[PDB]
Structure formats: C-alpha cells, structure tokens
C-alpha cells in the first residue's frame, strides 16, 4: 500500500508552468486556455467569472483555476464515462485560467452543461467542477459552480442536500444576468470568513 | 472490471491548510472543515489531451527557449513513474512543470531577485506519461532563492510540478527537491507536511547509472496518485 | 472528616474542545477559553437517585428488549470498579450506557445505515454502582460502523458511557473501546485526546477467567473520577 | 495517583442511552425527563426554555441538556450538602431534556432556586448550574443560568465577579417574561462568535 | 515446460497428527508415520469445475440465503490471491468457505449452542478464482464461540476454507482468523501448529483503502499451495 | 521460497460448506454429491462403501470423505493428465460425501477404474484415491483402495510394494462382493489401533 | 453473593500426565484425554473439619514425636498465606505436610536409604488456615535424597503438602523447595511443569525478618487455589 | 490474576502425611480414616472396594484414595450445598485410605448416597466423586463411581451422557453384590490400557 504524493503549494509563479502566455512566455504552439468552446460544441455559449477573496476581503491576484463539466447533454468527454451515450467530439470539458493581476477578475468561455447522473440512479442539478491553486494554498481547493435559474434541479441535488448546513448551500450558486446579448453568471469565491464557500473533499 | 470510487484522500498524509508557520496561508484557509461527499461520475472523470499537440521540445528545458546559446547552469535528467496507490501505472497523464533558472530567478513579471536572467533559459515544459506510467524530460538544475516568509527565508532548489490524469480526484500539484539539498531542513513550505517520510516522498534521489557521460546528471523521482477501488458487488456509482 | 474541593481537572488528560481532525467540533468549540472557578456546595453537590425505581433487567442488554427471540450477536458481560482518583470506591453512581448493534446500526431515527436492525435489541440499559464502586452488565457486543467525517470513516466497536455521581464536578460522558479491535488506531474522535496513555484508559480489557462456559465472554473496564482532597486547616467552601 | 477517565463526545445519537423515549425506545418503566417539579414541591414554578447555536448560528437540534439546583430555599437534595437546613423533601433538583429535532428548542419545568451560601461566608446570587452534550462536543459544556429579575443579587454574585470581561456576564441572565400566566426564562445558548456564552471549568 | 512432481510438503510447517492439547485427536490420529511415495499421475491431476454451474450469488453470503431480510452482523468482503509455493498464480482453483453467523451460531443440527440462530443467513459459499489467482466474497463477521475442549474453551471468530486445484497433492482445508481477535493466543487448535510465522500465516489482514464507505469493511487474505517442479532432463513421472 | 498454508481441522460441522443439503440448507442449485456416474459414463458400475473407526473402534459419525479416480481405461479428466488418450467425456471423476449421522455408513456410486500408468514405464493396478476430513483431525488423510479380484495387479503394484511391512498392505484392498445384482466393495477404514489403515504422504 | 463454578483449570500450569523423563509416570498416566465436564454441587462443595479435634503440637514437627530429646537438624518456620486465583483468602482450609528427616530419610517402612533415622522425628503435621487464609508450622529442613528413576538421580530438599478446602474442585496435592537449592534444576519432578514461572511458584523463599534470634529460620511461602466466578444473571448450578 | 500453585506428585510415601497409621506413626489423637458410618448414620451402610491397575495391569500398591460424597437424602455436609435441606447430623460425607501393601486392595465403610440436583433443573443419579494420588501421578485423578442397580436412573444422568462414547460409560459403575449380609460394590480402576477408566477436569 503506498501513499499518496503530498501535495505542496503551486507557488506565486504559478503561471510559468501552467499559463505561459500570461507570464509573456513562448515556448509552446500549442497553448491551453480558458475557451471550452469550439465552432461545432453545441449547447448554450456562457461566460463564468468571479473573483476570489481572502480573509480580509481582498482578492487573490495570483490564483489559478480549473474546471472540469459535462456536455450539453451531460455526458463527459473522458472514457471513464459509463453513460453508454455518445459525447460532444468538438469539446475538451476543462479550461483553465488565471486572475488578473490588478483587478483579480477571472472568466471562462464555456456551455452551460446537461444534468448528470447521481448515485444510486439519482439526477445531479447542472454543475461545474472548479478547483482553486495559488500562493498560500497548500492543497487544491475543490468546489462545484450551481446556476441559480436551476432552482427546481438544485432543490433535488444529492451533493447540495449533503450539505447539512443549509444556510451554506447558496453559496455554491452563481447568479445568472444578461450582458448585452450574452449570458453570464458571477461566481465569487470567499476563502475566508462570512459568506466562506463551501469546498470539498472529493 | 468495472470500477468503483477512488480510495480515500488519506488527510494526514498532506499539509493541513492552516499552517502559521507558512505566513501566507492563515488568509488563504478556510475556517470550516472540508465537506467529504460520495463520488460520482463528476470525480471519476477527467479530460484527454492528445499527444500531436504536444512540440518536440516541450520536455526539453534546455533547449525549448535557447536562442543564441544555451542556458547557463547545471544540465540534469529527470525521470521516474507515475503509479496509481494500488501500484497500478498511470498512462498518457499530463505533467506539467516550471522552475526558476540557475540563479534561482523565474522568469515572471513578479520577480526582482537579484538572481540574474537568463536569455536562454524558458524554465517551463510539459509531457505524457507512456503505457508503463514512465516520464522523462531534460533541464538545468534550479537554484535556492530568498523570499519573504520570516526576511531571510530561503527555499532550498525546487521543481513545480503538476498532474491532470484518469479522474478530477487525482488532480494534483506539487514540488520535488534534490536529494543532499541543506535547505531541506529548514523550509517551512515543506515542514506544512506532517510526517518525515511524506517529507522524504518529495525528495528526488541522484540515479548515479543514469547519468550520461561527458554530458548530464540524472534524478530518479517517482509519483503516486489516488487509486480506484474495483467493484465485484452492487455498483452505486450511477 | 471534612471534605474540600475536587481536585483540578488535569485538561492535559482530555481531549481539547478545538479537534480539525473530528470535523464537526470545528464549529461546536468555544473560541474563549473556559473560566475557572473555585468550587462551592454547587459544584460539590449532586442529584440521589433510589434503586427500587430500576427495573431487574436494566443492566441485560440481552434481555430488557427481547420480545420474540433473543437477539442476534456476540454474548458479553462487562464489569468493573468506578474508584475516585485517589482510589476511593464511588458508591451508588448512576451508570448510563447505549451502544448500536452487532451490525453496527443503533435504533435511532437519525440512523440509515445499511447496517441490518434487530428486533429484539434496544441498545441501552443503566445501573447503580455497590458500595466497592462494582459495576456489571450483559450485552451483544456491538459492531462498528462506517460515518462521515471523511468520507470511508469507521468507528470503532464502542460502548457509549454516562456518569453521575457524588459531585457535578464529576458528571462524565465517555466511551470504551474492545482490547484488539484494529480501527482503534485510525480513530478521530479517539485521536482527540493528547497522550497515548490516556487513549489506552477506554480500552475494556479481556477477562478469560470471568468467562461463563457455553454462554458469555467477559471484558474488565474501570473508571476513575475526579476526587475531593480532605480539609485539616480553614474550611472555606461556605 | 490515577488520572481521570479521559471524555470522548455523547455522539448524534446520545439519545438512545440518555432519553430512550425521544427515541421512540420502551425499555424502562421509570423514565427520567425535564420535569423537577411534583406535586408537593414548594416554591414558585417557572419555566426554562432557549436553543444553542453553533459557529454560523444555526441551533444544534442533537444536543442534550441537564441542568442540577438547590430547592427554593437553597439547599441541595444532596448529602453533600452542608447547610444543616432540612431540604425539600419532594425535590430531585436535577432534569434532562434534548432539544427538538426540528426546531431545536430545549427547556424544562422546574422551580426558581433560592440563594445559596458561597466561599468565605459570602452568599451567591439564584442560579442553575447546566451542561451541554452533543455531537462535536468532547467534553460537556458547563455554565450557568442567573435571573435579569434578580439584579441586586447579581451584582454581589462572586462567580460572576470573577470574570473580569465584564461585558461577558450578561450572557449568563436569561429573561424573564410572564407568558399566559406561567413565568419564563429564556436562555439561548451561544457555543461560537458573538456573544459566546461563558463556559466554566469546574 | 514438463512438469515433475509437486514439492515435497514440509511435516515442519503444519500441525502434526497427535496434539494432546486438542482433545479429540487423541483417538483419531494414527500411531504410525505417514508412509511418503513418489508421486505418479494419481497425485498430480485434479478435477475441473466448470464455472456455469455456479450461481450468481454463491459467493455472497449476505444475500444466498437471505429471505425476508438481511442478516445481522457485521458486513465484510474478504479478498485475495492463491499462489502456489514458487509463487505462480493457481487459476481456476474451487475454494469453498463455511462459518457461523455474528452470534457464533452454525446452522447445523448439532450446533445447539445458546447463541441466537439467523434467519437469513446460511454460513456458506464458494467460487473459483480468476487468471491471476483473485478470489473474493463477501459475507457477516462471525461470531466467537465456546466449545468443549476444556470446559470453557472458546475459538476465536473464524472463517473455515478448502481448496481444490491443479493436483490432489494440493488438497487442502484450513482457516483463517481476523487481525487483532484476543482468542487466537489461547486457541489450542491454532497452538497445533508449531511455529509462530505459520499461525500468523492464517490471519486475514484489514485492508482499510479498500473499504466501501458508508457499506463494508475488507479483509485481505492470501492462500499458498505446494507447487510443482519443472524437469529438464530424464521424465520419470510415467 | 514461500511456505504452504497450514492445515487446520475440517471440524465438526465441516458439513455445511462441503454439504450444505445434509445440513437440510439450500443455497446452491448446483450441489456436489457422491455419485460419479452419469447417463452415458463408461464402465461397470459399482458402489463403495464402509466405515471409518477410532482408536476405541467407534465409528467416525461427523467425518467426510472424497475421491479422485480415472475413467475405466484409466485416464484422469485432467488437464494434468499426459496420456495422450481420450478421456470419458461424461465422467468427473471426483466425488463427495458424508458419513450418516447415526450408522457412520458412508458410500459413493462409481465406476472401476482402469489401470493407470507408473513411473518409470510401470504399470499401477487399479485404485481410487482417498482422503478423509473431520473432528480431530489436523491434516486430511490419505489413502488408497486396491480391490480384491484384482490380486495379479495388486502384487505388482509400485505403490503397494513400496510398503515394506507386507502386512499393512492387505489393509489397503476392498472386498468385493455381489448384492442383489449390483457390484459392493466394502472398505473399512481404521485409524487406530490393530489393522490401522494405511495413510501416505503424497 | 450468590457463586457460580469453579474457574477452568489451566492445563497449561500444570505439568501433564504423561511426562518420559519421571519414569513411574510412563504406565500410570491415562492413554485417553481428561472429560471435561460442566460443575454441580458435587464439585463445588467439600467437607469441614472442626479445630478442636487437632491436638496442640499437631503444627510443630519438632515436638510432636520428640520422645527423649529433640530430633537433629535446621531448626525452621514456614509460613504464608493461601488464597484463591482471584486473590480471595481461604479461610479454614486443611493443611497437610510430610518430609523426611534432615538425612533425607523417611519414616516409612518402604524407605531403606543409608541416611540415618531420627528417633525423635516424625515427619508430618497438619493445620487450619485462619481467617485471613494464614497459616504456619515449625520442623527440621529436610535433607535432599537419592532416588531411583535414573541412577543417581537426587531429590532436592522438599515438603510435600496436601490441601481440602472450600470445593473439591480444588482439592491440591503439591511439593515445595527451598530458595538456592542446587538440585532444583535437575529434578525431573520438578521438570514436568512446563513453565519457568509455575517451577519458581513452588520455591519457599527466606524470610530473614521474621527469624528468630539464636532459635529458628523462617520460610514464607504462599499457596494459590481455584476460584470461584460470582452469579449476577441466570444460575444453572441447580 | 494469579496461577493456580502446580501440581506435583503425592510420591511413594504419601502414607507419612496422610494416613501415619499405615506408617506405623502415631503422633496425631485424631486420625482421618475410611469410615463415614457413624453410630446415628443414616442410609443403608455400603463398603466400596477395588484396586487400581496400571498400564501392565499390575495393581498399584502405594496408591491414596479419596471420596466425597452426598448423605442418604442427596444433601452435602457443606456449607457451600445451597439445597435448603437439613443434612444428617452425623455425617463427613469424606474419608480417606490406602491400598494394601501386599494385595493392592482398598475399601471404604459409607452409605449409598441419595441423588443430587443437577445443573438447569436436573438431577443426577446416585455417585461418589473419588480421586487417585499415588507415585507416578502428578496430578490427582478424578473420577466418579455409580451403582449398577441404579439404571434407571443412570441413563438419565447429565455427567454419563456427557460422555459421547457411550461403551467407556460403563466403566463407572461398580457391580453390587451380597456378600454374609452385607452389601458390598466392586469398583475396579484402570488407569491404562483396554477398558481405561473415566476420568474426569472438574
Ligand atoms: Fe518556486
Ligand atoms: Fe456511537
Ligand atoms: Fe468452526
Ligand atoms: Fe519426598
């Protein structure tokens, strides 16, 4: 039986491993981004931001972070996937991204994604898996985007009724509003304090 | 086989997020206890990058941003396996890292160490494990650097490292330093890590029949990631 | 002889309120730390309870509950001594215990376990200790269970234990552990407390000679409370 | 010189053991509950009722509660005690009760205790010594309930006294307030926060 | 490859015949030695057991006998692999287990033992293993119980087991026992055994990482059989 | 170099793995008996039976007993088998029972087996392997039954020579006789005490 | 107090029937295993002697057979206590002892041994434990002998000594040595007890406190008995 | 926990300390013989003899004999007898004696005991529990002697059907017969061989 690799911090520099163009950094053609979509993905175009606060409510500059969803029909483009149904071939499911170092602010192009199986033959309420890397931070922190005009699907969730703190159930879902044409929802991360987003251990 | 959930995140064999003597982290942890939730497909999955996309110098430190030379510093070989905790390899995983260059400065925005520049230096590259979990790449050795912990801090010679492979449970980022390294000791970002051998888990060890004569050193470190449990009775997952 | 005060509390000897390792004490800790005080007749004193209100079989686990059959499980006695720290016998303490099943379940609305339920098992039973301190009890040693804390967490097979006796200062809730059971080492909530000595103070020890031919094994456990020093010079407590 | 036996939390389901009743269990013919008051019992009865809260102030609705006091005149039905007074003959002085499992409230019909003597010849002011027991709690909680009615006495109270934030002695005061005709204390318990309730070491 | 004959079995590395401290071998051991023979076609072949005719839940006994419930009991899956003695996997080997249920109870008619009778559970099961000499079921803890041997005797919680594989030199039963029980260091049928390695080579280890949360426990435990010589010269088998 | 498992007692009620129906059980709709031959098995049928006696010359009524045999032209349904001949495709050759709780009586339902071939170019004469299980014993026993009429290949038999007390050797030969119209042979088994079974180390 | 049976006796600290290396015991020892069997009043009860029946000089081998002078030899005190298993005094128990002289003869008519007979010893004696289990009588230290098991085979110094008490389930018949005698490594007798602590549990030890000035020595030695288990739920004695 | 104190062996001259007389010594007033028939005895007196054989069948001639036995009406002479029934007055219910140097013959003048309750409400037949101390024992054996003309109630008794080979019951039964007018029970031991009597770890 062996153990897990330890995990250690992703550092301040974070971005010259993991971003390069944002660190003025070219070494690679081929670079990975935060745009999930493509010319043929189908589904709803959305755009996911927010920022991330620490404990005094400011946010983190240096962060990095990833997530993980479903096509438009709930299906994940991973062969791990046993739904026996046939994924989006013009979508990658992961992005990844870093805040701007002055404002903070950090964003995603992506689908809004289907609902996934649960266990035990059970429905999960569309989500996004998100995680959070950056100085200070000693271990990923895990943590699922909801939408809020999903009310009726949220409601019936099994990972948001595992959550026996109720109050801190509304803390995992993003806020939905129509810029100018284009659908956003806001998402902001508390580390710390009042409002803490809830993160898990997946 | 059909699979079930992954094993367990064993907590105490990783840093616990509150850690004072790492000053960063007491406003970048949270107060409440993480939420341990029952895995779904959400946890077991995780994306596929293809290889084509991948250039021929990507594992090459040394070469993937020389110009009109090559970097100053000391030319080394990384190599070892990527395994699952059951043993099992982990192929085609992504590995991405980053390091500073031999004066012990990175070449990022953020970074005014008097350390010096090198204009032949990139320090980032990336690669996929084979069938048998192997990896390998090429780079010069990273040099100690000062940063403001207690004033005069000092991270003994370090290679970031990170791992996208079969589930979003395994993700995973880290760093790897070099076995003899005096700074080992005294770094408050590895003494976050409880236990002694977990510290020594980190450690590369100097593969001394793998060096290459006239030429390069080479460093043996293996990694381990969470593993999935088979499942011969009901299967809950869906 | 005239009584003082009960000794200090050795808060070294216990678990501290603040335990991130047992997840919900996170939030049910006081962020102050406690106020001591110096005791009065309120702190020393404590309730009587009669024995002819016990029924004869509240200390059978076996049987207070049994209704068609005998339930399902491994037949064991427990005894013991409740002494005060400087070895005095308690005499006519009030002893509460519950425990789950032998499948680990305990029949409480709040418990969906998998775990199968025995009809004819309730799970709890009380006692008054002689004038040595003696106490005795039957039951179906109970199994151990998995719970969330991370989530593959497992309790322990375990006892829960209750405490009243001659003063408020020494009301006590606790719980004992089987000598040999493995999970005792990867507990928690057993974790919480500091020394190693004291985690070994709740595990009941195998008593062969008190074992009952063809019907019962037997496990010694005994329990040492807080005690009241005597008083020679000033007496101050009024 | 042995230690004591070291505490481990009552767990969730400190019921079973504690109040098989609530438990929907029928082992017992004699059921001990949150009821002090008989029927020769002397003095004036009252009622005492409250929550506990927790860090994000959500009441704990698996907590138990038992509270121990002397009898109207301030003598304890206890051998213990020392006073010489003749005790009330038809008092336990001693309850139990749990909080619901929906609402969380918690309280007990019992009778206003009377003055009782304090160290060195002083005299403390009417209170009720409680303990709280729960999940997440390692070692019962143990504080002190004293009456806003009774501020005279208060004032001289030498516990109360020898807190020296004073600005922490009101969370020991529960309020009085005459419901149809019955007299009730409210007292809610604050374990985390603002306003935290002090915690005794006895 | 030819295959010689099985490995000489080691007279050392199991009880012997006659074990005065186990009564009832007193009268059913031999007085004379075991005449040894040189083996011939006899002694190397076996039966083969096709796999269709088992069924689907020959292997679970938690549900092959369940009928209004499920049984009471603690909820393990007992793991592991059947090598032979130089290490090879034993495939499609018949290994066939048989025990009591948590109340130490066997389902038989000269069990009248006071421990209560499970409705659901019957105590036995069976299954072949794979390619690589995995097996696995899953089955209800069981439960200690008293004998007469000497008038308080009592076996420790044990899971009975025979094997039937490539050869009949190989046939072998025996049991196994569960890490930590107290009864395995006073068990006079375990103390037949002459060396301290062999007994603890019957005791089934916990496997915590492959746990089901929230479900049932594991334990691993691995099977060795004599194991045949390969020949390279003169074939004298027949 | 790793060691064998040790061997343990079948025990008393070795019955309910081995047996399940004559523990009155019913789990397996497939069960394992004492009757080794099959609608189109070749071969002259004939029955086994007898007792197996402890050093007081009782009965063993809680032992269980099985067999490995080849087909009547001697070839094992085997893998193992090296022959090179054809085996009886409707024959398992292995078989299973238990003695009678009350008589001790056990028997099995077979064919004779035909000579099979020894080492070194020898000739082995016929016989059926044989091991017993139960209370008290440690280690399964093994044995051997030769048959009576078959004296000229009985004395040149390796295995029966091998065995340099000649006298032991008659302990190892069934006697066979014809009931109503059907073939017995009778074998009883001693395991202590005068005529003690002969038991090999194979 | 209501008692139920006996304690199990343990095998294993006593020396075993069969024992080759004591000779006699090769034909008088059972071919067949001991039956052991559940307790009724046959077993727990046992006869009572009355005091006034013993003579005053029935304790002091000195005096009781001294005719014209007193025997030749160590003048020595034995005393000690007798207590059950579980540390319980065993209140008027018979006591019964017989030795040889300080030549190591007997004044028995089977003895010819060259060691000289002491026309003022007898050899025996008996007593009553008291209340508090106490007992003690004075004699002359016996004198080791020789013996024919191997040829020159030699007894160490020893008083045989015989107890009936409160069950005849404890009935004991036993021998003693005396702390640094030679001989007790090599007595075979002594030798069929398997354990090193039992073989000590059998050595009267000097008690130099309690000798008395220009008179005698003095030995304690201290006996240990069955106990029997108390009855808190069913009674089956009867 | 203590040890039980070893057994050791009574020795050849286990007569000096217990039985003086057959040793020629006379230093005791009071000596334990073989006789528990007193003057007031009640019961029909009985005299028990035999000889203890060895593995050669030689009798033993330094052996020590011991029983214990219940009065006339099933009733201990013992405190520790909880039947609530008056015992004969007059009655050790012990005794002790030697075989005969020369012949090996031993005997006791008793009465035939009345039956004892067994355990769980049962109730054993008539015996006398007798134990054997002798050079070359080194632990004394137990054992139990019945009357033949008690059948009836023999084939009822607990302790004889404990004994799961039935044939070595017999062994236990001493054969009645009249000699002049007195009634006298033969009960031979053997402690080896053919016929090896019970013995018993009570
Ligand atoms: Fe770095
Ligand atoms: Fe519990
Ligand atoms: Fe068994
Ligand atoms: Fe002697």
Same mark, same amino acid.
Request: with cysteine.
């Given at each position: ?36 979509? #493509? ?11 927010? #920022? ?17 969803? *479903? ?7 991973? #062969? ?34 289907? *609902? ?8 999960? *309420? ?26 009726? *699907? ?15 159930? #509304? ?32 | ?42 946890? +077991? ?6 290889? =084509?996309? &991948? ?10 941003? $020389? ?25 085609? $995983?992504? +590995?991405?890292? !980053? ?16 350390? $010096? ?29 000062? !940063? ?5 801090? !000092? ?29 080992? =000791? ?20 100097? =593969? ?5 004569? $006239? ?5 043996? &470190? ?10 011969? &009775? ?5």
């Amino acid at each position: 039986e062996l153990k897990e690799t330890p995990s250690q911090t992703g550092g301040p520099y974070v971005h010259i491993g993991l971003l390069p163009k944002q660190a003025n950094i070219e070494v690679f053609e081929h670079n990975l981004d935060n745009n999930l979509v #493509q010319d043929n993905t189908q589904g709803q175009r959305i755009r996911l931001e927010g #920022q991330v606060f620490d404990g005094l409510s400011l946010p983190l500059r240096d962060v990095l972070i990833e997530i993980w969803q *479903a096509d438009t029909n709930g299906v994940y483009p991973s #062969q791990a996937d046993t739904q026996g149904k046939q994924v989006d071939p013009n979508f990658l499911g992961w992005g990844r991204t870093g805040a701007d170092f002055g404002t903070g602010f950090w964003s995603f192009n992506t689908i809004k994604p289907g *609902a996934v199986p649960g266990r035990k033959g059970s429905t999960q *309420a569309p989500h996004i898996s998100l995680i959070i890397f950056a100085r200070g931070i000693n271990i990923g922190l895990h943590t699922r985007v909801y939408f809020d005009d999903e009310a009726e *699907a949220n409601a019936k969730d099994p990972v948001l009724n595992s959550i026996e703190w109720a109050t801190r159930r #509304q803390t995992l879902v993003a806020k939905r509003e129509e810029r100018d044409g284009e659908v956003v929802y806001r998402f902001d991360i508390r580390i710390q304090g009042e409002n803490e987003t809830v993160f898990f251990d997946i | 086989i059909i699979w079930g959930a992954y094993a367990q995140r064993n907590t105490e064999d990783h840093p616990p997020a509150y850690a004072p003597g790492y000053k960063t982290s007491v406003l970048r942890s949270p107060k409440n206890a993480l939420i341990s939730i029952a895995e779904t497909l959400s946890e +077991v999955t995780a994306p596929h990058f293809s290889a =084509d996309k &991948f250039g021929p110098k990507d594992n090459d430190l040394i070469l993937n941003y $020389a110009k009109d030379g090559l970097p100053i510093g000391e030319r080394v070989i990384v190599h070892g396996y990527v395994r699952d905790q059951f043993g099992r390899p982990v192929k085609n $995983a992504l +590995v991405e890292v !980053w390091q500073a260059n031999a004066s012990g400065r990175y070449r990022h925005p953020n970074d005014q160490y008097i350390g $010096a520049m090198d204009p032949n230096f990139g320090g980032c590259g990336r690669m996929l494990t084979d069938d048998n979990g192997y990896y390998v790449f090429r780079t010069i050795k990273p040099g100690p650097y000062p !940063w403001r912990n207690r004033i005069n801090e !000092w991270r003994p010679a370090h290679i970031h490292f990170s791992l996208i492979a079969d589930g979003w449970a395994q993700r995973l980022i880290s760093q790897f330093y070099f076995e003899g390294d005096t700074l080992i =000791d005294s770094c408050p970002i590895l003494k976050t890590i409880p236990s002694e051998q977990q510290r020594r888990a980190l450690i590369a060890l100097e =593969d001394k029949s793998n060096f290459i004569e $006239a030429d390069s050193r080479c460093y043996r &470190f293996d990694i381990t990631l969470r593993g999935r449990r088979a499942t011969y &009775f009901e299967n809950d997952l869906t």
